[PDB]
């Protein structure tokens, strides 16, 4: 069970702060522009996720000219950031 | 009865095992606890770890000399530590003046800001008798909390 | 090639030479009797005749500065905010301030 | 003498020609004394005008000094004027140590040395901590060796070595370190002082 | 240890303003009530790191008072202890501006070597330390047996021990990524700050007081004087280094010419006579009697010395009475003009920058105090 | 190469004691170390040397058991140790029973004494002068 | 002098550029910086344990006080104040008094160890050498009040140092 | 189901015994001695850390907002704990249906752990310092990803089963050359304090080190292997442990050996540098199984 | 004229009325953004105490390096610096405190 294994490690690392709690008794917009891309870059990964589990069944010719594109335009993505991205 | 007097020695055995010291540069003093970290006289890893961090650690060391700019600066550092805290005033200056004394601006005693527990008498404080402050430490404690 | 100060070893000559003529004038405008004017034109002087004589050589730049002519450059770029200083504020021609008290041993 | 002399006078002579230099210019607004002894050269200025000096030095075709690096003052209360600041030179391209001094009690402002020379407002913070003399046109003059709730200037012969305000309890209070406790330990007065003149020459007249 | 006050426009540094002096001592009006011999252990407890540089500038400074030079002998351990300091000093340069980075081995890979150094300082003076070694009347007490054997086998292994750090630092893309270009500064305007002992020599002006003004036997002993290019904290690093190798050849030139002969001042008036020598002799004892409580007698006059410290000067400025108390004196040490640096060091930089400036520098806090 | 540095492990444990000794320079001292022992000292102090092993090194030397009256072998601090400190210990060269040999007076103290730390019997300040009299009677 | 630290272009054309480019993309550097500790993993650390081991030392160190005594009995000390007045803290302090009839050694004796910076200087200045300064590390107290020495007393209780002191002074008669 | 126990004791034990070997294996690099007083070889200490934290160690918090700071360090040992489960081994405990997908997303969820922390504290000075390092971990999560795939894309389904039958003769080490060193880097982002550094604070350290030990077995099987021997699971549990220690020596020897690389100059490194290499690397195992024939 | 100092007499008076409303202003500031410690409305009276000490004017030399000094102890508030309510507290908090009489004074005998 996926359900058993996942709760088991969460009750047991809830049970180590009580241990601690109850036993003892006497500003700068440039870092946004980085979290930014890194959604906008993650959402590209998300799409070029599936290749090592999609390319079985499906022609070769046709997916190459479309797996490297979107390869390209993250890196033009890149290219955009070079022309002044700021100090960070 | 007997299982009682027995697991209070084991949670003083635990502070006999590690201390880690606050890593105060205020002193020539500080260059002498530094050759604390110098292999030839070490108690790294024997007990001593100088990651500090003004929290986490247990011990303080007032290094040498104190002035009136630090009184209320190292003051702040004590209630930041936990309750288990243990304060050496290694170095003559830090014992009552070890120079100066007489001076406007270097603070008497230090216990004056901070009560001290193990105090350590020499100016340059060779790193043998550095020993010392640590040892008696892990000595001093011996019965805490019988009721 | 390039001095080891910030100040950037630029290859020019005859540069030294415009700077050291125009604090000549500057000289003559106001102190005539005051002993400064009489003293620091002599030097001055004594410099231009080296680089006059000298064309491009290190051995110009070896006397009195031994430092390239960046900094024998650098000596006369102060020189001209001096001697305005100087003229300004009088100083060398004029001699009438008051006497200290009658002390001095230890 | 082969130990007792320590070096002969030889660049003596050498160094009394800037004695005669810049005397030969004759302010009574700049010049006043003129003092060399032990291949030194020391050098009093009038109150009105500081700034005329420091400008003179820096640059120059004569001598190069440039760096008008140290900075000290004397107390001392034997005079009508109290206070002396004095300025330590050097010289990278000449090779030379001389003195500029400054004779006024200066309790009254002082002409300030900081557009001349940059690591000198630093120093200025200092005499008007430990000695109490302000400087004029002077940018940021802020407290550096005194502490924060420290009250006079504490180098001042007029007080003694322990002060006014020196110990700090914490005791009653939970946060508060104390301040108006002013009981120290006893220093002892040496009272050691040679009977007759230690040196001839240096004897003056009553 | 500092605290240093920030302005930050948005991650870089506009404004650096430090509001240092938590450690003022107040040695300027202590010394004052002190004798001569009284206050001589005040200068080695200045600096943190320099024991025998110390003392040196403020004896040299009695003796240009005095006008008594110190024995042949006694010069040879000046110079041969002043280059030990050179060590000392610049190891510290080394290690606590890498611990304060992040490095950690090349400060414990130093500190084995320096805790055998200290070896040197136990067999020739009490403490560990600080030590009253260095005195107005030339050297306190004359080196051991034992010690001038140890020095050539300390010095045989050393070279390959320096040379271990350039392999493990130097080469490293780290450095040459972190503390390259970090306030290039060279010009007049640097020249206006006064920093003597690196910074200056470290980059630009080829001026050191080692080759222009003799102390206690130079020029006769070869030194080697490293000078950069730019102004950045590598360069300025570089040059420590540099200055380390070309340290040794001094200390075995100096185990070279040794004149076997005096170790204090023959005359009675400002060094105390030889133990064995007091208790049978009358004059003696009596000049021990008044050469300790009474100080010296010094000659009235002001006298300004300054001996080249690895961190930069001791300006030591003497003011003296016809009594045996110096009344007034300051010990100008580079920290005064390190900190000042801080207002053009920190132009365009980042945080992170700032810890890289006072590693280079080497702003040891012990240092501001007059 | 291999089967010298094995070899010469089990050699040290073999040495000193065995099973039971083994354990004692293993768990109370911090290093275990076999070489050549003086075993001449106040109490029950050993004090070895000879070996080589690094610079400003005299070998194990080890804590005495009950030095006075602690009754500790656990832990035991710089106090043990009879006047030795300054000959073979750091300082000289030759040992205090075998070569250079400690001089009598009759003013020293014959049995060593422990540190003071926060345990009755320790040290004390204390007034010297007679101060000035004052006295009133009937 | 001149020695230079700026490296004025190594890299020129080809085979000189391309060594300094592979620094920069890979490593090889930094893998060569970890051969550095990696040796220095295996050889021999230079550790005490102080329970246990002891590290170097001096015929000549200062450390605790103590004032010895001639072989004879008696007490060394002729109080002169003359240590009083050498000492840089003014930790030592002297009042004498006539010993019953005839002799005149000492009454009150505190030496301050919250004072003190250890100079050697009351153990050069004393004629007679008394305070004489032996090898000593162990001190550690709970007050100041048991920290600092009092009238002789603890001073001349360090007769278990002084065995240690009379072999330290032979090597100290001719110094070294 | 008795093994989840059987993963958590011995693994919260294995995070407590690094003590000893993240200051004496650094301690050699650093040619000073460790632990050595406490035990006979210090073996004593790792449990006695636990005892002086846990049980005697109070609290004192700046604010405390009602659940939070109370609910940050179960968010920090939940994650690197759950970690232990997709784990291939010689045998997993309960497979899930694709591996390495797992693996990533409690990875990218443990960036809530430092994130809870700097909401903790009231005050403004300590939560840019804790953004600052939400930013060294955010950022490298890019190039994870990336580099991952790579991997993948050479042989294997995202089931991590199915990645150790493909190194039957030789290592994925040889023909991902530069990806190799991509993973020594990337994996020191998540708070191993070694190219940047910024009661419930001593479980942080619980958490913390368990990934490091997290990142040196994924490392172990994404490019280490030697042999399968599904008869024999004797040679294969004692193979895999020395592999794993090998790279927990690495981990610990770029904390000694080099300096901070600073926050500004971490981001020119990655972004500036390393997305440009490690897409064109992406670029060229695109084309690998189209080139030659090499599809699971 | 000689010395300077910064104003003539009548001047100097001003730069004081000046100075008095600058320190006015932060006794309510330095509550919230400092600590409560005492009151807002008892530390306006330590202002009104401090300046009655000061109340002499004889020369416009002595006011002027007052106005200095006063532009130094009383600022070590406004550009927010460290003290943590033991630098710049002037009252005395432990203080006997003594009183001016030969009745208080010579029992508990000083002097
Ligand atoms: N605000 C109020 O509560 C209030 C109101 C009106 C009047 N008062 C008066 O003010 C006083 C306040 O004192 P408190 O309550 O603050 O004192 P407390 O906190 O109880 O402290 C007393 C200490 O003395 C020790 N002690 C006392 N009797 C002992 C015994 N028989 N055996 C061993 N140890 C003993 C205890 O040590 P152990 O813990 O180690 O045993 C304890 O640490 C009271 O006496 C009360 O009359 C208080
Ligand atoms: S006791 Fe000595 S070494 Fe320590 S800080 Fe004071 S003067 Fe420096
Ligand atoms: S210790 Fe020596 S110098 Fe001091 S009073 Fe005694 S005999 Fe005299
Ligand atoms: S060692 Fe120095 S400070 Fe200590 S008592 Fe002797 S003279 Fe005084």
Same mark, same amino acid.
């Given at each position: ?14 049970? @180590? ?42 022609? @070769? ?6 797996? @490297?594109?979107?390869?390209? @335009? ?15 | ?147 | ?106 | ?47 009105? /005008? ?112 322990? /002060? ?43 | ?370 | ?138 | ?176 | ?296 | ?6 104003? *003539? ?27 409560? *410690? ?74």
């Amino acid at each position: 069970n996926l359900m058993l294994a996942l709760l088991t490690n969460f009750t047991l690392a809830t049970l @180590l702060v009580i241990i601690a709690f109850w036993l003892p008794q006497l500003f700068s917009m440039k870092f946004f522009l980085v979290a930014i891309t890194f959604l906008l870059f993650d959402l590209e990964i998300a799409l070029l996720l599936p290749l090592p589990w999609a390319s079985q069944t499906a022609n @070769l010719n046709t997916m190459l000219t479309m797996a @490297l594109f979107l390869i390209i @335009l993250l890196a033009v993505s890149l290219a955009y950031e070079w022309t002044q991205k700021g100090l960070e | 009865e007997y299982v009682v007097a027995k697991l209070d020695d084991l949670i003083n055995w635990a502070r006999r095992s590690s201390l880690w010291p606050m890593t105060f540069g205020l002193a020539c003093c500080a260059v002498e606890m530094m050759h604390m970290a110098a292999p030839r006289y070490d108690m790294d890893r024997f007990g001593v770890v100088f990651r500090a961090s003004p929290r986490q650690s247990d011990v303080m060391i007032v290094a040498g000399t104190l002035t009136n700019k630090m009184a209320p600066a190292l003051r702040k550092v004590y209630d930041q530590m936990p309750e288990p805290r243990y304060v050496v005033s290694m170095g003559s200056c830090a014992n009552g003046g070890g120079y100066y004394h007489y001076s406007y601006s270097v603070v008497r005693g230090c216990d004056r800001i901070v009560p001290v527990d193990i105090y350590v008498p020499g100016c340059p404080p060779t790193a043998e008798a550095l020993l010392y402050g640590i040892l008696q430490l892990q000595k001093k404690i011996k019965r805490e909390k019988r009721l | 090639t390039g001095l080891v100060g910030l100040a950037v070893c630029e290859t020019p000559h005859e540069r030294l030479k415009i700077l050291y003529t125009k604090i000549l004038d500057v000289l003559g405008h106001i102190p005539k009797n005051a002993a400064y004017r009489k003293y620091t034109e002599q030097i001055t002087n004594e410099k231009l005749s080296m680089v006059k004589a000298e064309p491009d050589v290190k051995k110009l730049e070896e006397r009195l500065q031994g430092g390239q002519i960046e900094e024998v450059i650098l000596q006369a770029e102060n020189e001209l905010s001096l001697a305005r200083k100087m003229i300004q504020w009088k100083p060398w021609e004029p001699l009438v301030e008051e006497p200290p008290a009658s002390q001095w041993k230890w | 003498r082969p130990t007792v002399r320590p070096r002969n006078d030889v660049a003596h002579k050498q160094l009394s020609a800037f004695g005669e230099y810049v005397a030969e210019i004759l302010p009574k607004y700049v010049q006043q004394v003129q003092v060399s002894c032990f291949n030194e050269l020391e050098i009093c200025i009038h109150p009105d /005008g500081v700034i005329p000096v420091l400008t003179f030095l820096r640059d120059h075709s004569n001598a190069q000094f440039k760096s008008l690096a140290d900075l000290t003052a004397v107390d001392i209360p034997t005079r009508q004027n109290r206070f002396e600041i004095v300025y330590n030179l050097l010289s990278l391209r000449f090779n030379s140590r001389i003195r500029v001094k400054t004779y006024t009690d200066e309790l009254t402002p002082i002409e300030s040395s900081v557009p001349v020379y940059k690591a000198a407002n630093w120093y200025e913070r200092e005499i008007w901590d430990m000695f109490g003399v302000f400087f004029a046109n002077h940018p940021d003059l802020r407290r550096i060796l005194t502490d924060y709730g420290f009250e006079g200037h504490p180098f001042r012969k007029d007080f003694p070595l322990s /002060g006014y305000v020196e110990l700090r309890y914490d005791d009653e209070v939970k946060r508060v370190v104390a301040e108006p406790v002013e009981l120290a330990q006893e220093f002892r007065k040496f009272d050691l002082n040679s009977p007759w003149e230690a040196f001839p020459a240096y004897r003056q007249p009553p | 240890v500092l605290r240093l006050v920030m302005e930050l426009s948005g991650e870089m540094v506009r404004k650096c303003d430090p509001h240092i002096g938590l450690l003022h001592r107040g040695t300027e009006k202590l010394i004052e009530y002190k004798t001569y011999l009284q206050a001589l252990p005040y200068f080695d407890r200045l600096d943190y790191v320099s024991m025998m540089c110390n003392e040196q500038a403020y004896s040299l400074a009695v003796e240009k008072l005095l006008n008594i030079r110190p024995p042949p002998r006694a010069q040879w351990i000046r110079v041969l202890f002043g280059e030990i300091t050179r060590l000392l000093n610049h190891i510290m340069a080394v290690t606590t501006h890498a611990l304060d980075i992040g490095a950690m081995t090349p400060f414990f890979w130093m500190f084995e070597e320096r805790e055998k150094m200290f070896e040197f300082y136990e067999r020739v003076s009490g403490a560990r330390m600080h030590a009253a070694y260095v005195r107005p009347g030339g050297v306190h007490q004359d080196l051991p047996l034992g010690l001038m054997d140890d020095i050539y086998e300390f010095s045989k292994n050393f070279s390959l021990r320096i040379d271990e750090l350039e392999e493990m630092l130097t080469n490293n893309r780290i450095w040459r990524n972190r503390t390259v270009d970090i306030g290039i500064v060279t010009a007049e305007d640097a020249l206006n700050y006064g920093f003597s002992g690196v910074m200056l020599r470290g980059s630009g002006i080829q001026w050191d007081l080692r080759k222009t003004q003799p102390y206690d036997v130079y020029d006769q002993v070869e030194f080697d004087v490293p000078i950069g290019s730019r102004g950045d904290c590598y360069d300025r690093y570089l040059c420590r280094v540099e200055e380390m190798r070309q340290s040794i050849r001094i200390i075995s030139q100096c185990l070279n010419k040794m004149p076997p002969g005096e170790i204090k001042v023959d005359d009675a008036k400002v060094s105390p006579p030889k133990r064995a020598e007091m208790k049978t002799s009358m004059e003696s004892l009596i000049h021990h009697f008044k050469l300790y409580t009474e100080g010296y007698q010094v000659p009235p006059g002001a006298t300004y010395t300054a001996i080249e410290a690895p961190k930069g000067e001791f300006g030591v400025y003497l003011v003296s009475d016809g009594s045996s108390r110096p009344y007034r004196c300051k010990i100008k040490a580079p920290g005064f003009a390190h900190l000042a640096g801080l207002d053009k060091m920190s132009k365009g930089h980042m945080l992170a920058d700032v810890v890289a400036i006072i590693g280079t520098q080497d702003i040891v806090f012990g240092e501001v105090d007059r | 190469e291999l089967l010298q540095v094995l070899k010469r492990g089990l050699q040290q444990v073999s040495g000193h004691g065995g099973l039971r000794g083994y354990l004692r320079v293993l768990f109370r001292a911090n290093d275990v170390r076999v070489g050549t022992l003086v075993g001449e000292d106040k109490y029950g102090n050993k004090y070895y040397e000879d070996n080589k092993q690094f610079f400003g090194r005299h070998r194990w030397v080890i804590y005495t058991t009950e030095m006075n009256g602690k009754n500790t072998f656990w832990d035991v601090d710089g106090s043990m140790v009879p006047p030795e400190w300054h000959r073979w210990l750091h300082c000289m060269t030759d040992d205090p029973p075998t070569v250079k040999p400690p001089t009598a007076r009759k003013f020293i103290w014959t049995n060593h004494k422990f540190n003071l730390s926060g345990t009755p019997q320790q040290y004390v300040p204390y007034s010297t002068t007679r101060k000035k009299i004052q006295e009133w009677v009937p | 002098t001149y020695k230079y630290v700026n490296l004025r272009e190594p890299s020129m054309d080809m085979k000189s550029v391309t060594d300094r480019a592979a620094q920069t993309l890979l490593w090889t550097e930094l893998i060569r910086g970890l051969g550095m500790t990696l040796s220095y993993l295996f050889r021999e650390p230079a550790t005490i344990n102080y329970p246990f081991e002891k590290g170097p030392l001096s015929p000549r160190f200062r450390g605790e006080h103590a004032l010895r005594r001639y072989p004879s009995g008696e007490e060394r000390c002729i109080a002169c104040k003359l240590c009083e007045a050498v000492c840089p803290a003014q930790a030592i302090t002297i009042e004498a008094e006539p010993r019953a009839d005839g002799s005149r050694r000492t009454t009150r004796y505190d030496i301050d160890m919250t004072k003190c910076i250890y100079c050697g200087f009351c153990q050069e200045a004393c004629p007679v050498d008394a305070i004489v300064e032996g090898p000593n590390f162990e001190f550690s107290t709970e007050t100041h009040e048991e920290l600092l020495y009092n009238k002789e007393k603890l001073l001349n209780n360090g007769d278990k140092w002084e065995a240690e002191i009379a072999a330290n002074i032979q090597a100290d008669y001719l110094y070294r | 189901m008795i093994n989840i126990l059987m993963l958590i004791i011995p693994i919260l034990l294995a995070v407590a015994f690094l003590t000893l070997v993240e200051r004496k294996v650094l301690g050699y690099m650093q040619l000073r001695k460790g632990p050595n007083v406490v035990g006979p070889y210090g073996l004593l200490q790792p449990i006695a850390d636990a005892i002086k934290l846990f049980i005697k160690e109070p609290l004192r918090p700046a604010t405390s907002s009602a659940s939070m700071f109370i609910l940050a360090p179960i968010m920090a040992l939940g994650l690197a704990l759950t970690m232990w489960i997709p784990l291939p081994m010689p045998y997993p405990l309960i497979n899930m249906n694709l591996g390495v997908l797992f693996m990533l997303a409690m990875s990218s969820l443990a960036v809530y752990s430092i994130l809870w922390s700097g909401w903790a504290s009231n005050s403004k000075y300590a939560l840019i310092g804790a953004l600052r390092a939400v930013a060294q971990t955010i950022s490298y999560e890019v190039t994870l990803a990336i580099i991952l795939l790579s991997v993948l894309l050479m042989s294997g389904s995202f089931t991590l089963s199915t990645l150790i039958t493909t190194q039957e003769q030789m290592w994925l080490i040889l023909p991902a050359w530069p990806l190799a060193m991509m993973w020594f880097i990337s994996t020191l982002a998540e708070t191993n304090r070694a190219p940047f550094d910024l009661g419930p604070f001593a479980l942080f350290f619980m958490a913390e080190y368990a990934n490091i030990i997290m990142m040196n077995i994924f490392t172990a099987i994404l490019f280490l292997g030697t042999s399968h021997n599904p008869h024999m699971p004797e040679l294969y549990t004692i193979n895999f442990t020395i592999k794993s220690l090998l790279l927990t020596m690495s981990f610990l020897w770029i904390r000694a050996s080099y300096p901070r690389f600073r926050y500004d100059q971490l981001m020119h490194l990655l972004w500036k540098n390393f997305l440009p290499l490690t897409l064109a690397l992406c670029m060229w195992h695109v084309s690998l199984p189209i080139l030659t024939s090499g599809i699971p | 004229v000689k010395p300077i100092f910064s104003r *003539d007499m009548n001047e100097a008076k001003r730069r004081v009325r000046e100075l008095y409303r600058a320190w006015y202003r932060e006794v309510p500031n330095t509550v919230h953004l400092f600590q409560l *410690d005492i009151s807002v409305k008892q530390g306006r009276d330590k202002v009104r105490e401090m300046f009655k000490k000061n109340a002499h004017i004889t020369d416009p030399r002595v006011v002027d390096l007052l106005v200095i000094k006063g532009k130094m102890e009383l600022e070590e508030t406004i550009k927010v610096w460290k003290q943590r309510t033991h630098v710049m507290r002037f009252f005395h908090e432990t203080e006997a405190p003594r009183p001016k009489d030969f009745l208080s004074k010579f029992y508990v005998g000083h002097d």
